[PDB]
């Protein structure tokens, strides 16, 4: 992704040492060992495979995203309210485990009332 040096070719340089290093190979997508001569080259050059993976592999990312409050937002049965509108809404059905459509009046009801299937599934079909 962001790190541009990951797309640079392995560069041994012109010096004559045989130092084991790691570089990100874009054809394979793998951190790959090469011999580094000890001077020059580029930033696609890591002492350990771990350092390479951290800089150039797919990153470690958090999954700490909050869902709806299950009790108030996902558990209650569908409620149309008092108004006489015909709005298609979605609710999580505890029995079936699915987000399903119901007809909503426009006023009242509960929090288990979403504008799309995918919003409902996001916030109700997760912990």
């Amino acid at each position: 992704q962001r790190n541009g040096f990951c797309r640079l070719p392995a560069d041994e340089g012109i010096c004559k040492a045989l130092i084991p290093r790691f570089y990100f190979n874009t054809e394979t997508g793998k951190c790959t060992m090469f011999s580094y001569g000890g001077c020059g080259g580029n930033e696609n050059n890591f002492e350990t495979i771990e350092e390479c993976q951290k800089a150039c592999g797919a990153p470690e990312r958090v999954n700490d995203f909050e869902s709806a409050d299950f009790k108030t937002g996902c558990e209650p049965a569908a409620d149309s309210g008092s108004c006489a509108g015909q709005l298609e809404r979605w609710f999580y059905n505890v029995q079936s485990g699915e987000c399903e459509t119901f007809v909503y009046g426009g006023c009242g009801g509960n929090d288990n009332n979403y504008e799309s299937e995918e919003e409902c599934e996001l916030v109700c079909k997760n912990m």
Partner: protein, 255 residues
């Protein structure tokens, strides 16, 4: 965003979170350009070295967000995509040249205090605004520092982050990197000794680089967070997809 601050509520109402629905994660930033179209980086969607080729079934966009993690009921809008369009000349192998993608929403969304599209530059706006030293604004939910010692957890923002960064002249951008730069890119950030810091980081990619026009008071998206060399390193700068240079492609896809 490194060396930024918490954004005010509604500071950036065009800000879009590109969101993976399977392992729930922030993939990337993006921007709302109409009630129907979202602009992002191609590499957010397609990157073969990481076996990455996201379909409309893999993704959601979350618009109107402030908190990175809270479900902002009745303020944020969560929606699926209809279509994905990646630039056909996107150079993933070399330098991420033409790092641009268009995302068509499945349904048009309603605008609010928190949801509102950014302007795209015309020729005169790009000429007047793209001057070295002029500052633009970058926003995102990405990492707050490039590296951590124990966990990626210690570098997460709780809310949207903002940083203002000066545009940098071509010669300075060129000398900062071994990577080949094109006219589809510009770079931004402070120089060593300017006494100020700030950069985009991992997770901010696809996000907007915007400038407020002194001519008509409107915000224009001049760039897309594309690539860099680490985050906020001395002597290094962030690179951004030059939106006006790729405007012909945007119009072709939308028309």
């Amino acid at each position: 965003i490194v060396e930024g601050q918490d954004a005010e509520v509604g500071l950036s109402p065009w800000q879009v979170m590109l969101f993976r629905k399977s392992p729930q994660e922030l993939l990337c930033g993006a921007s709302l350009i109409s009630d129907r179209w979202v602009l992002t980086a191609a590499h957010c969607l397609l990157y073969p070295p990481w076996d990455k080729n996201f379909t409309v079934d893999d993704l959601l966009v979350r618009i109107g967000k402030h908190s990175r993690t809270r479900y902002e009921r009745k303020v944020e809008k969560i929606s699926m995509l209809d279509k994905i369009y990646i630039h056909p000349r996107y150079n993933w192998k070399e330098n991420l040249d033409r790092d641009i993608a268009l995302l068509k929403l499945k349904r048009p969304i309603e605008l609010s205090d928190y949801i509102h599209p950014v302007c795209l530059p015309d020729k005169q706006t790009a000429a007047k605004l793209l001057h070295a030293g002029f500052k633009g604004r970058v926003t995102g939910w990405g990492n707050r520092r490039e590296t951590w010692t124990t966990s990626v957890a210690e570098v997460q923002p709780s809310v949207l982050q903002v940083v203002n960064l000066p545009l940098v002249e071509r010669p300075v951008c060129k000398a900062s990197t071994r990577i080949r730069i094109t006219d589809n890119m510009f770079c931004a950030g402070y120089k060593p000794g300017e006494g100020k810091r700030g950069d985009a980081c991992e997770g901010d990619s696809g996000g907007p680089f915007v400038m407020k026009s002194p001519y008509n008071n409107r915000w224009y998206q001049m760039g897309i967070v594309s690539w860099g060399e680490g985050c906020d390193r001395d002597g290094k700068y962030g690179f951004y997809t030059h939106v006006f240079r790729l405007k012909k492609w945007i119009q072709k896809v939308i028309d």
